A paper describes a structure:
The human immunodeficiency virus type 1 (HIV-1) trimeric envelope glycoprotein (Env) is located on the surface of virus particles and is the target of neutralizing antibodies (NAbs), which are produced during infection. The assembled Env trimer consists of three heterodimers, each formed by a gp41 and gp120 subunit. The trimer contains around 90 potential N-linked glycosylation sites (PNGS), which account for approximately half of the molecular mass of the external domains of the Env trimer. The densely packed glycans on the trimer surface shield the underlying peptidic surface from recognition by the immune system.
We also describe here a new SOSIP trimer, AMC016 SOSIP.v4.2, as well as high-resolution cryo-EM structures for the AMC16 and AMC018 trimers, adding to the repertoire of stable and native-like Env subtype B trimers. The AMC016 env sequence was obtained at 7 months postseroconversion from an ACS-participant that did not develop bNAbs. The protein had a native-like trimer morphology (100%), and its midpoint of thermal denaturation (Tm) was 63°C. The Cα root-mean-square deviation (RMSD) value, a quantitative measure for similarity between superimposed structures, was 1.1 Å for AMC016 versus BG505 in the gp120 subunit and 1.3 Å in the gp41 subunit, while the RMSD values for AMC018 versus BG505 were 1.0 Å in gp120 and 1.5 Å in gp41. The electron density for the AMC016 structure was sufficient to allow the building of 26 glycans out of 30 PNGS (glycans indicated in green), while we were able to build 16 glycans on the AMC018 structure out of 30 PNGS (glycans indicated in green). Second, the site-specific glycan composition and occupancy of all 29 conserved PNGS on the AMC016 trimer were assessed by liquid chromatography-mass spectrometry (LC-MS). Most of the PNGS are dominated by oligomannose glycans (green), but the N136, N142, N462, and N625 sites contain predominantly complex glycans (pink).
Numbering used by the authors:
A (entry chain L): 1 to 27, 30 to 91, 96 to 106
B (entry chain B), E (entry chain F): 520 to 546, 567 to 663
C (entry chain A): 32 to 57, 66 to 134, 150 to 309, 312 to 321, 321A, 322 to 355, 357 to 396, 404 to 408, ...
D (entry chain H): 2 to 35, 35A, 36 to 52, 52A, 52B, 53 to 82, 82A, 82B, ...
F (entry chain D): 466 to 502
G (entry chain D): 265 to 309, 312 to 315
H (entry chain D): 128 to 134, 150 to 167
Write the structure that this text describes.
């Protein structure tokens, strides 16, 4: 019934730590990620095949294990305390928030 | 058998088509006419590139030749039975593809030395 | 022992390659007027124990067919007649719900000192109203483009053309029959040319292509991706009989010093809608089989066929080139049913068809072609060999799959005909160890 | 160039709104698919549908958008349109125009560029 | 050393680059496209002219050959030390340039006689 | 001496950029005397 | 630029009708501006022109 | 014929003119 499930929803990490954000893909397939700030349009971070998006200075990376794709944030650079979303073709996830 | 019919044959057996393969290398500015002119030029240049190299090597005029370059273990450490008798040419070409330029360069240098030395001995 | 380097020339190996392919073939047809014949027969070599990857979605032979059809089409059309002198106000009323109009106009003659009022018959879909007076009309595309009338001597018959490799190159063919479009093919052969492929212009149905050997084969790069085209290749054709039963006059006027322009002249008898007659039983049996195969790609859901909600008219309606005429047929009725997993198997299906004379294949920006009028009556018939379908998104957890006619991208038709072929280059020189120096 | 986004008006229930986005010739003609999405406040991101830049063919993320929303494109004016009929308060959301240039097949759906976005408000 | 790097070397020493020099002899109707097509045709024809002549002479397949034509004093009366060891090839080619056609004609006639006579003796 | 801006002939600018180059053709075949027949 | 000095070349310095080409070994910097904020306007002058 | 007056010592002028449209009428 649920195509894409977002986990953990909310994380709290101090600067210098590494975030681990993830989503489960119903019926597998590839999964991509986007970053959003309030009042701003989202931007591509990584391809669904884990290639980094152009414009990203090697802060984001990830891989998929079975159905679960995990995206990580290197050293929680402060500029990246953004809401993140998962996408699997036509479906989007619920979104994950980052606090301190 | 036919062209490339030896593709699945072992390298040794496949020598039976060397002539056959060689034969397929050689055969108003409208849309098709322009493409045809370019095709003729391409075919000729490709044919000649192979002939020039065989001309540098002591190979031109033959389908099979040997020069004074040894074959070492970094390229292949297999017995001839596991090369000539248990592999096809495509498998082989891929297995040693990282040495294509090396081997060819070694062939040219050895041949250059062989021709230079033999000719000097004849002149001396 | 010791080994020596030995050199062999004439080695039966190859690499992937893209090269330029040329034409061959078995009336002044735009595609065949300046080409060469095929060999009496192609040869085939079965490459026993050879397995190779094919990919119909990345086939550069498709890209060349696209480039050639555009260039060939344009070469034929270029030296014809410019219609700019005719971009004047038309004055008409209709002669079938107002579809055909008889319009007068003010056009300068070959004599620069004189003007001649003249008349031409047009189809409604090629003209638009001017300044709301319900009588004045303009050619629909003249505001932005140059409309050129094709020379009447040019035939558009889609004579099949074989694509042939130049020396030093070869074409490999996949003989799996039920090949899914990519990955390895374990039964392959070497040929010099492809079979002849007919350059048929079409949108929703694939007409006059090849048939599958054993079953309807449905191919998609990714069935999960609702934005991609699904290509359905049938193993049995469906028969379609198309007629434009109107006895026409070809009339000509001059629009300059040697510039002849052809229009529809006096209609003999009454006016009737063009129609395409599709056998109903054949269409119904075909859909049953398509559905069985579509069900196999999804979790055994009920399948329903629907019509498109939008797109250019050239996309929404099924169109084709008939006896030089351009038809736009209402296909809604062909895709208006729900098929079930427990379902199993007499009259005619009729599609009303509209006619247009001003068309723009390949969307050339700033250009359009005007089809000539054809006198007498037109009849043609075709074989339906496949379908371009798409899939309705938003249906996850809806318990049914919904499909619609897709298509409109001509390259999707060429991907079917060139489906089985790949281009490689011959690499005759290589080395191996030997016993002798 | 970031997609130029118009709109941001206020409508009464039952009203229609037309929203459009623009790009340059060089971006438009290298784009295969234009997508529309919706972000109602606090609800997350919902996909609406797409328009193919070549044929004008369309699709949707829901049968309800298919029934009420007409999507299209313009080749000479490098724009795209989202025509929404039957507006209700439940449709208040930020809407966005975004491009996919990624004719990469099985790789997946990607958005190279998202435009600024527009806020459509429906109220009595 | 590189292409023509032997140009300042003596004629004898310069034999070290004969292969190198030979290699540089072999490698949509827009302004540049037309010029490129003509360039390819020219390169091929030039290559083949040299090969045909070497084919007439008993030279094809080799970089160095000899035929039965004596070298007389009207061409050069220098010792080999003042030819091969004290001159470069450009100096030499200029020194005897008025005999290019003569020597070549003598080579063809002598070779024609050598092939004709040897073949008749084999047939007889 | 009195000097003025001249120019206007575009080839005079190309003579500067192409200043250092010359085109030659390769003549790979030639003859010489030897000791052996 | 020239490598060591300004090099002045002429086929014949004596011939006042010939061009003297001066090649500098150091460049001189030139900054050009047209400081007018313009609008590009288009009109049609025919059917697609 | 262009019809104008200047808008920098008269360097730039804004000129009207009578030109036939894509509509021949
Ligand atoms: C899928 O595949 C099918 C099968 O190939 C294809 O249908 C065929 O299309 C062709 C081309 O449109 C049709 O050929 C025309 O047929 C008519 C009728 O001929 C009848 O009488 C002759 C008598 O000898 C019989 O042999 C024949 O079988 C029919 O009973 C002809 O009148 C047409 O001739 C004109 O066009 C020719 C173009 O090549 C010219 O060469 C010829 O000289 C004629 O043109 C001149 O005279 C015209 C007078 O009206 C004038 O207007 C012209 O300007 C010019 O001066 C032509 O031969 C063929 O019959 C179709 N086959 C069937 C079974 O219907 C489908 O089109 C294809 N589907 C798709 C989508 O592509
Ligand atoms: C376009 O369409 C294609 C085809 O439908 C989709 O392809 C899927 O891609 C995903 C992600 O790449 C695949 O998921 C992973 O595949 C691995 C390879 O599978 C092979 O090897 C296993 C060995 O056990 C065989 O069973 C299998 O048949 C293949 O031969 C698996 O190894 C992965 O397994 C993971 O989970 C198991 C759990 O038990 C662990 O043990 C493993 O170590 C590992 O963590 C996983 O399954 C998926 O399989 C592909 N589908 C198919 C049918 O092959 C594309 O994704 C799609 N495009 C888009 C955009 O969605
Ligand atoms: C692998 O592909 C080859 C084709 O490249 C298949 O071989 C072909 O098999 C058909 C069988 O029907 C042969 O057809 C013959 O037609 C004549 C009439 O023209 C008829 O008299 C014969 O009795 C026969 O039906 C066809 O000639 C043959 N082609 C070649 C080149 O050999 C092969 O079967 C495929 N293998 C697999 C496992 O699919
Ligand atoms: C689907 O529609 C087609 C087209 O109308 C039907 O075929 C047509 O059937 C009629 C008979 O009912 C044929 O009429 C005959 O014409 C000849 C003309 O020479 C005349 O001599 C005979 O006396 C008779 O009147 C007609 O020719 C034939 N059409 C064609 C192109 O051959 C078809 O039967 C319909 N199918 C179904 C399932 O309803
Ligand atoms: C199109 O042509 C018709 C004539 O064929 C014009 O209608 C006539 O107008 C005159 C007045 O100028 C009347 O006296 C006639 O009785 C009208 N005839 C008919 C049949 O209506 C018509 O005005 C023209 N329309 C345009 C837009 O030019
Ligand atoms: C057609 O079927 C073949 C298997 O017979 C599929 O091949 C897989 O392709 C992927 C991508 O190259 C490889 O990683 C897998 O290892 C292949 N599978 C096997 C068993 O080798 C192919 O993807 C299918 N294609 C379509 C369009 O369905
Ligand atoms: C167009 O209609 C004709 C007339 O029915 C079709 O011709 C018949 O085809 C069947 C095929 O099973 C034959 O058994 C009949 O003998 C044919 N009739 C005649 C008079 O020859 C024709 O096939 C139809 N074509 C299309 C594309 O629908
Ligand atoms: C469009 O209207 C014109 C004007 O009535 C028709 O042309 C006339 O046809 C008759 C009968 O052949 C001739 O006697 C007249 O001399 C023609 N008049 C002119 C001005 O040419 C024309 O045939 C009509 N077209 C259609 C398709 O109905
Ligand atoms: C298309 O084929 C289907 C399946 O054969 C036909 O389905 C029939 O549906 C009616 C109810 O509307 C049932 O009473 C019949 O028993 C079904 N037929 C069979 C063989 O089971 C459907 O009618 C066909 N469509 C057309 C236009 O003929
Ligand atoms: C297209 O098909 C329709 C049927 O759907 C044809 O119209 C009638 O068809 C029935 C059944 O075959 C015949 O008994 C009638 O005699 C036909 N009609 C009329 C009005 O005479 C229609 O004729 C077909 N049209 C074409 C061009 O083939
Ligand atoms: C549509 O497909 C049918 C398939 O049967 C074609 O009919 C065959 O055509 C071949 C070549 O002329 C004949 O040898 C067969 O005898 C025909 N079979 C039957 C049953 O008629 C038909 O020609 C195809 N039509 C088109 C447009 O190509
Ligand atoms: C155009 O003006 C700018 C501004 O003065 C020049 O840029 C400076 O160049 C000097 C070169 O010695 C540097 O040391 C400065 O740091 C540069 N300034 C800046 C802000 O970057 C530029 O070179 C001028 N160009 C020309 C052709 O005149
Ligand atoms: C799936 O469908 C059922 C039945 O209509 C519904 O109750 C459920 O909420 C739906 N779930 C999702 C994730 O759409
Ligand atoms: C294919 O495999 C068989 C069985 O090992 C072998 O006899 C044959 O020579 C191989 N190659 C070809 C081209 O048939
Ligand atoms: C093979 O020959 C190359 C080239 O001379 C040399 O670099 C390499 O070390 C040799 N390898 C072995 C195993 O002798
Ligand atoms: C060539 O080198 C690459 C590493 O750069 C290696 O992955 C590949 O397997 C090598 N291929 C062969 C034929 O040795
Ligand atoms: C055009 O037709 C409409 C009716 O569809 C009518 O209301 C209008 O007045 C007509 N205009 C002219 C100029 O005749
Ligand atoms: C078709 O492809 C499948 C791939 O799994 C293979 O097993 C089968 O033998 C092939 N059929 C042929 C060559 O007829
Ligand atoms: C077409 O394929 C179906 C499914 O495999 C089969 O039942 C039918 O007999 C095949 N067709 C023909 C026309 O012989
Ligand atoms: C229908 O789909 C279900 C999964 O939802 C599966 O378990 C069942 O076996 C399928 N039925 C058939 C006939 O394949
Ligand atoms: C099976 O037959 C029943 C008859 O009542 C029908 O309602 C149902 O839709 C059919 N198909 C499937 C897949 O259940
Ligand atoms: C059109 O009418 C004329 C009347 O003279 C007749 O000769 C001709 O055969 C008819 N054409 C058709 C296709 O019925
Ligand atoms: C140049 O002159 C020197 C000194 O006589 C000599 O050793 C050298 O071989 C000559 N040629 C070249 C190409 O260096
Ligand atoms: C050299 O050979 C030519 C050609 O046979 C002859 O004419 C000439 O007299 C000879 N010169 C000398 C010095 O022998
Ligand atoms: C060739 O002959 C001319 C006289 O016609 C003479 O000036 C020149 O030096 C000669 N060149 C050679 C290499 O003998
Ligand atoms: C340019 O040439 C002059 C004259 O030889 C010299 O004094 C100066 O140092 C040279 N230039 C540069 C830019 O180093």
């Amino acid at each position: 019934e649920i195509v894409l499930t977002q986990s953990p929803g909310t994380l709290s990490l101090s600067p210098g730590e590494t975030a681990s954000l993830s989503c489960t893909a119903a019926s597998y397939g590839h999964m991509t990620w986007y970053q959003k700030k309030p009042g701003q349009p989202p931007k591509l971070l990584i391809f669904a095949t884990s290639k980094r998006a152009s414009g990203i200075p090697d802060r984001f990376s990830g891989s998929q294990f079975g159905k679960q794709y995990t995206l990580t944030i290197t050293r929680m650079e402060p500029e990246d305390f953004a809401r993140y979303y998962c996408q699997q073709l036509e479906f989007f996830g619920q979104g994950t928030r980052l606090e301190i | 058998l036919g062209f490339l019919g030896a593709a699945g044959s072992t390298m040794g057996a496949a020598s039976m088509t060397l002539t056959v393969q060689a034969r397929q290398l050689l055969s108003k500015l409208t849309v098709w006419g322009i493409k045809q002119l370019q095709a003729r030029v391409l075919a000729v240049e490709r044919y000649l590139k192979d002939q020039q190299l065989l001309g540098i090597w002591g190979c031109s005029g033959k389908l099979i030749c040997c020069t004074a370059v040894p074959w070492n273990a970094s390229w292949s450490n297999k017995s001839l039975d596991n090369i000539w008798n248990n592999m096809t040419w495509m498998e082989w070409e891929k297995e040693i593809s990282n040495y294509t330029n090396l081997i060819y360069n070694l062939i040219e240098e050895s041949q250059n030395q062989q021709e230079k030395n033999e000719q000097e001995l004849l002149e001396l | 022992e010791e080994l020596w380097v030995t050199v062999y020339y004439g080695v039966p190996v190859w690499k992937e390659a893209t090269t330029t392919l040329f034409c061959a073939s078995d009336r002044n047809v735009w595609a065949t007027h300046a080409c060469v014949p095929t060999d009496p027969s192609p040869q085939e070599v079965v490459l026993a124990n050879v397995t190779e990857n094919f990919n119909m979605w990345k086939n550069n032979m498709v890209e060349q067919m696209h480039e050639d059809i555009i260039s060939l089409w344009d070469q034929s059309l270029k030296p014809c007649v410019k219609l700019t002198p005719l971009c004047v106000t038309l004055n008409c009323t209709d002669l079938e719900k107002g579809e055909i109009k008889n319009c007068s106009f003010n056009i300068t003659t070959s004599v620069r000192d004189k003007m001649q009022k003249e008349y031409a018959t047009f189809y409604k879909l090629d003209i638009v109203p001017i300044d709301n007076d319900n009588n004045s009309y303009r050619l629909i595309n003249c505001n932005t483009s140059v409309i050129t009338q094709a020379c009447p001597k040019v035939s558009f018959e889609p004579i099949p053309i074989h694509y042939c490799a130049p020396a030093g190159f070869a074409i490999l063919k996949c003989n799996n029959k039920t090949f899914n479009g990519t990955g390895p093919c374990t039964n392959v052969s070497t040929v010099q040319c492809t079979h002849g492929i007919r350059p048929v212009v079409s949108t929703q149905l694939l007409l006059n292509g090849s048939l599958a050997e054993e079953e309807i084969v449905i191919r998609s790069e990714n069935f999960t991706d609702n934005a991609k085209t699904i290509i359905v290749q049938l193993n049995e054709s469906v028969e379609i009989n198309c007629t434009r039963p109107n006895n026409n006059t070809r009339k000509s006027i001059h629009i300059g010093p040697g510039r002849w322009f052809y229009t529809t002249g006096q209609i003999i008898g009454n006016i009737r809608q063009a129609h395409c007659n599709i056998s109903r039983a054949k269409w119904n049996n075909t859909l049953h089989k398509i559905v069985k195969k579509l069900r196999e790609q999804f979790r055994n859901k009920t399948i329903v066929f629907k019509q498109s909600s939008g797109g250019d008219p050239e996309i929404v309606m099924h169109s084709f080139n008939c006896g030089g005429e351009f038809f736009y047929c209402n296909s809604t009725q062909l895709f208006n049913s729900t098929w079930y997993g427990n379902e199993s198997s007499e009259g005619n299906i009729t599609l009303p068809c509209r006619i247009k004379q001003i068309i723009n294949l390949w969307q050339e920006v700033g250009k359009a072609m005007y089809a000539p009028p054809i006198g007498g009556q037109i009849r043609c018939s075709s074989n339906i060999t496949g379908l371009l379908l798409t899939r309705d998104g938003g249906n996850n957890n809806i318990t049914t799959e919904i499909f619609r006619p897709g298509g409109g991208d001509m390259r999707d038709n060429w991907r079917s005909e060139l489906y089985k072929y790949k281009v490689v280059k011959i690499e005759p020189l290589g080395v191996a160890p030997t016993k002798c120096k | 160039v970031q997609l130029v986004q118009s709109g941001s008006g206020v409508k009464k229930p039952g009203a229609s709104v037309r929203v459009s986005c623009w790009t340059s010739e060089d971006i438009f003609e290298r784009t295969e698919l234009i997508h529309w999405v919706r972000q109602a406040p606090g609800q997350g991101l919902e996909w609406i549908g797409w328009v193919k830049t070549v044929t004008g063919a369309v699709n949707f993320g829901s049968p309800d958008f298919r029934q009420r929303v007409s999507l299209t494109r313009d080749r000479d004016l490098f724009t795209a349109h989202m025509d929404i009929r039957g507006l209700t308060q439940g449709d208040t959301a930020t809407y966005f125009c975004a491009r996919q240039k990624f004719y990469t097949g099985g790789q997946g759906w990607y958005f190279d560029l998202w435009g600024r976005g527009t806020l459509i408000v429906v109220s009595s």
